Amino acid sequence: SANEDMPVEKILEAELAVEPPNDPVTNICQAADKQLFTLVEWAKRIPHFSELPLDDQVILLRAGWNELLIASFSHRSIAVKDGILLATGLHVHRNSAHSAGVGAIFDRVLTELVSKMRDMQMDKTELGCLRAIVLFNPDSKGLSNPAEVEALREKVYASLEAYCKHKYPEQPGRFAKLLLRLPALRSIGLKCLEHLFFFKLIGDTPIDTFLMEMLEA
Template sequence: CRDNKDCLIDKRQRNRCQYCRYQKCLAMGMKREAVQEERQRGKDRNENEVESTSSANEDMPVEKILEAELAVEPRTETYVDANMGLNPNSPNDPVTNICQAADKQLFTLVEWAKRVPHFSELPLDDQVILLRAGWNELLIASFSHRSITVKDGILLATGLHVHRNSAHSAGVGAIFDRVLTELVSKMRDMQMD
């Protein structure tokens, strides 16, 4: 467990901490002997899923998803350091900068989703439910991926670079460091493009 062995385990966050999930299962009456049995059942199920996902790949090729990504968010080669004050229209507060970037990114996220194959064919209510359920993970993944080339900071959708020191000064250092170590550095190590 990364925290104090008291992670919130609910329907949405059950996979975030294996230790706390396991402890909650035991507390709720799960038998320890069931663990291996469940793992075996999952293995059988996963073998069947591999067969079915290959046909799903034909309906939604990665190229189409990448096309949607490139259409809504062109790559920027330059960025502005939020601490430098080079942009007079932008506040110097990292939290405000992050909120403004998140706002911009949410609009981009909706546009991206509309371009993903089959998404717009879903009923509008289902589209809204999916976006509401996944916007935060998609947002964090997006700025984490954008920040691969940046050292000790996060590159926001607005083009602003928030340095680690600024985040710590603003009181959001813990979550900031967690994003840097658990997402950005791992994406960098995997050489994600």
């Protein structure tokens, strides 16, 4: 009954829901603002996210927004060859990333995220669970009841591993192989936060305040 606590099918519903002046920095910023305007829509369709207190909802979203977007545009970029497919439809390539001062991040996204998801054929369901795991992060500081949050996260572990045993029985170590993208995702997500000063997301509006107004909406 693992899939009943945290339904795979409802998680993919959340992914499929929020799935989508021209210069590098502008292109990245506007791609970020777009996906930012719809995380709250995504998280709301994650099982039991809405049943959490509203102050906890804000915290979890402000804690993983960058890493939720990176995971999402990395998997989306499996199509593109040697580049990033932004949520706005634009293709960003190495030089364009160097122009934006994020060439090293670009290279890491390609080798540690896109290539790995490509070679193991990570489907959108597993990406969704990975993002749900990122969402239900119990270390998020200020959380009112973290025990509920990692009870929720562990339900995603249970569902995801159940799904992997089901759809890929010939690959017993596939659940672990998926999880091993999460350290890379965290590593890369940290480096991106170093560039926030150059990428004005929203009208310099505090990310915190933005999500809350989306939630109390």
